From Swiss-Prot, chain A:
The modification N6-acetyllysine is found at K133. It comes from Homo sapiens (Human). InterPro entries: FAD/NAD-bd_sf, FAD/NAD-binding_dom, Sulphide_quinone_reductase. This is Sulfide:quinone oxidoreductase, mitochondrial. Its EC number is 1.8.5.8. Binds 1 FAD per subunit. Disulfide bonds join C161-C339. The modification Phosphoserine is found at S303.
Amino acid sequence: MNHYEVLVLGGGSGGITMAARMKRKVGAENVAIVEPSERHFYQPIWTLVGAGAKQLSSSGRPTASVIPSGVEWIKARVTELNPDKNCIHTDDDEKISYRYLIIALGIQLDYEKIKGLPEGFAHPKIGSNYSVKTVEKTWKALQDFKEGNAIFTFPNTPVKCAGAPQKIMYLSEAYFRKTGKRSKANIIFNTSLGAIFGVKKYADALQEIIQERNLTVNYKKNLIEVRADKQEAVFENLDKPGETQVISYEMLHVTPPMSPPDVLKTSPVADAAGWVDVDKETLQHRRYPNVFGIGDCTNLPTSKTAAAVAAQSGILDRTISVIMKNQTPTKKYDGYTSCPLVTGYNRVILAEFDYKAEPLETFPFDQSKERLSMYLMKADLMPFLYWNMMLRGYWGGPAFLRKLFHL
Amino acid sequence: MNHYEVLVLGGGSGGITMAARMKRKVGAENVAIVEPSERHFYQPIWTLVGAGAKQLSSSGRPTASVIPSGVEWIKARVTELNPDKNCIHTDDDEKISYRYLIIALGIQLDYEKIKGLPEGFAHPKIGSNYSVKTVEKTWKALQDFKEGNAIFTFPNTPVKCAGAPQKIMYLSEAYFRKTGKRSKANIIFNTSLGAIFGVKKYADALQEIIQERNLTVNYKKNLIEVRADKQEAVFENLDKPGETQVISYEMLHVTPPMSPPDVLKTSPVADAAGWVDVDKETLQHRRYPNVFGIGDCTNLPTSKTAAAVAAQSGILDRTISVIMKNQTPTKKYDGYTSCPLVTGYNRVILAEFDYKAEPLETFPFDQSKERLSMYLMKADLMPFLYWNMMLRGYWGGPAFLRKLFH
Ligand SMILES: Cc1cc2nc3c(=O)[nH]c(=O)nc-3n(C[C@H](O)[C@H](O)[C@H](O)COP(=O)(O)OP(=O)(O)OC[C@H]3O[C@@H](n4cnc5c(N)ncnc54)[C@H](O)[C@@H]3O)c2cc1C
Ligand SMILES: Cc1cc2nc3c(=O)[nH]c(=O)nc-3n(C[C@H](O)[C@H](O)[C@H](O)COP(=O)(O)OP(=O)(O)OC[C@H]3O[C@@H](n4cnc5c(N)ncnc54)[C@H](O)[C@@H]3O)c2cc1C
Ligand SMILES: COC1=C(OC)C(=O)C(CC=C(C)C)=C(C)C1=O
Ligand SMILES: COC1=C(OC)C(=O)C(CC=C(C)C)=C(C)C1=O
Ligand SMILES: COC1=C(OC)C(=O)C(CC=C(C)C)=C(C)C1=O
Ligand SMILES: [S]
Ligand SMILES: [S]
Ligand SMILES: [S]
Ligand SMILES: [S]
């Protein structure tokens, strides 16, 4: 069997980041990354790509160029995990064994669970900022919008970046005002959830925007079918099972249902729901002490964001070092995550909170306000920090900055 | 390869029931059931077996004994579903094709997601009414109870028969009074949920029982580990991530986390959560119009019960007949389900409700009262009606009875 001291499953945000940090602990020759994609994407900027403010090409780089230098890139898909025997299977009919395993497989998009998708994306007026293949379609639907309903959805599953399905709604609204067709737009957000946002401070600031900008939100309403050729969409009322509703659209932004990666769903390392079952504070796996998890694929009960990955990578780095010398981990992840809620082409409400879903803000000012500074940070500084600091293993979240300020 | 007009996946409550109904529609020779288990169990009576009021031997019959005559029993496990090619795969490497598919694969028990199970069951004082292998350990733990915490758990997943985890707690409480050792038992229900029951009328009834009979209920508390050799159970506080609590027990009753069967989790027929993705009124699959689902494996947003299965079976029978006649289905399932809440060795609160979580009571009296009549119905009549009417395709729930009593 091919064998690595440290095996990292997934070469996305958590996976590259954890590889860089482990390369410094055990040497690069002893780290490997299993990743099928030829290309590594900074997904947060896709919100702005779909609103025409950023280029798609700049959001990605060849996976080879972000593999930490000297680390083995195994270009393949994980097809099975066998933790009892400290190995995994790949779709190249190889098995790979490990001393330590870091699982960073992200979340899976399930567009096909919506009847009429993904074939419906072939038609005009419909897009999705969650896929490299549909994010520019969001922008063409917005550009081409003439008059009628502009509908944005939120599915009945866990998602990554829970703020993004409404970020694109606020940008669309601002685009209609800037181009003079706001009066011809009936803007609707049909969300499976019960509330605009999970934290009251930001929910409240967001509700104010909902009222001032004449947006409609229907709660407990899930998209179940798209008829793209007829520009109609079908939603179920999650509160009155069996009741559906058909509604035409001049533009539709689909946030797809999401789920754990298929290979984890039935794996021994998953919990009952298919997420990687790790300790909530140390990210060490609950039942296999040499397995760890980070990011979207875990069952960490906080928002699934890259800011969370950043904050988790700093904890996991310590956890693994403590475990490597048969000691009890002591530093504890707090559930830190962040949500740069783009409310316009020049504003962001920067939500930050922890496991108790209470504000944990970095800056000494009220981040519940729409801010130019926070927009520039998301649009311009965060991509640079990601490529040049987070992926090199030098970004574990802004806790030190927060304590630096409050001083 | 082998092909059947109607292929039924699963030979449990809905599988056998649907195969019987379909035999009458397409003929026995055109129906097949894929089912691996040699034994078919009437699971509801395990609540009473765990309490030592019924025998485990009587809850099961050979699978061969309930297969409708003429209907092919394919003794195997489904390992793959390919609805785009109208076929499924089994674990003896056979491709089976169908004209229509009924999926009745049930719900999967995931004991091993509780750290320390299922190896913990080898130790005394721990049991589980949800498994043929542990229901009798419940009753052993109940009799052997001397003094301490009697702990009953409810997981953080969907479940079948959501009432059964408290049913055995009430039975245990009555047993302790009847054997003089009630003063020696601290009885605790540690549930992942935030409410005792989702229908307020029956939740208020159970709330009075809890208060009158000195039971503790701790909400948002989820069992995560058993240390059966030390008789300790670990709970997480769902309201404060990171917080846990280690409790000693003298008796522990585990309700295991549950999930869609593994073969369905990654299947095209599943919704994103892994449940069979069916129309909530017709039970026809949303995306594969020759696929249907019934029972615990579906995403029907009501309680996962045998009574729901029976009411579903009448609807699905009509849905499939109408489709075969090139008509559009019209008769609608209302979410009917029933929970015969055993509150003691002589009493049942018969909860009956629909999709809107509103009571939908068959009998003209108040079923939120503890009733002897309802206990005898659960303990003696329902098993009889199950084996001899429901599994033969002649029980579609009690809606006709309801209308007659009203
Ligand atoms: C539109 C959008 C906007 C967002 N905005 C923000 C934002 O403003 N702020 C923020 O903090 N976060 C944001 N996010 C979320 C952020 O992108 C993710 O949370 C982050 O990428 C999670 O990192 P990860 O490593 O867990 O998953 P990913 O970065 O997605 O990486 C997972 C990797 O695993 C690989 N993989 C999958 N299956 C297998 C397999 N079987 N074998 C091998 N490899 C496999 C995939 O190819 C992928 O490379 C946004 C996301 C989207 C979609
Ligand atoms: C302790 C207990 C008490 C209960 N009490 C009540 C009660 O009072 N009232 C009530 O209404 N309900 C009650 N129920 C619930 C009731 O038993 C179920 O809701 C009912 O059995 C659902 O039937 P089903 O066909 O959906 O699943 P099941 O009856 O479980 O049948 C599913 C079948 O699929 C088979 N199978 C699984 N995987 C595969 C595969 N890969 N390939 C092929 N076959 C497969 C299994 O072997 C099984 O035979 C109780 C359940 C329990 C556990
Ligand atoms: C349909 O979406 C809407 C809401 O949902 C969040 C509102 O609260 C409101 C505000 C209503 C009050 C009484 C503040 C409006 C006007 C609205 O359109
Ligand atoms: C790109 O993804 C993100 C991070 O990871 C690099 C962050 O650390 C943070 C937090 C950083 C600060 C300065 C609050 C945010 C908001 C974010 O969006
Ligand atoms: C065996 O499980 C059960 C059924 O399936 C046969 C029922 O139909 C019903 C409903 C039947 C009546 C007479 C209300 C109940 C309560 C039940 O527990
Ligand atoms: S986000
Ligand atoms: S977010
Ligand atoms: S039940
Ligand atoms: S129930």
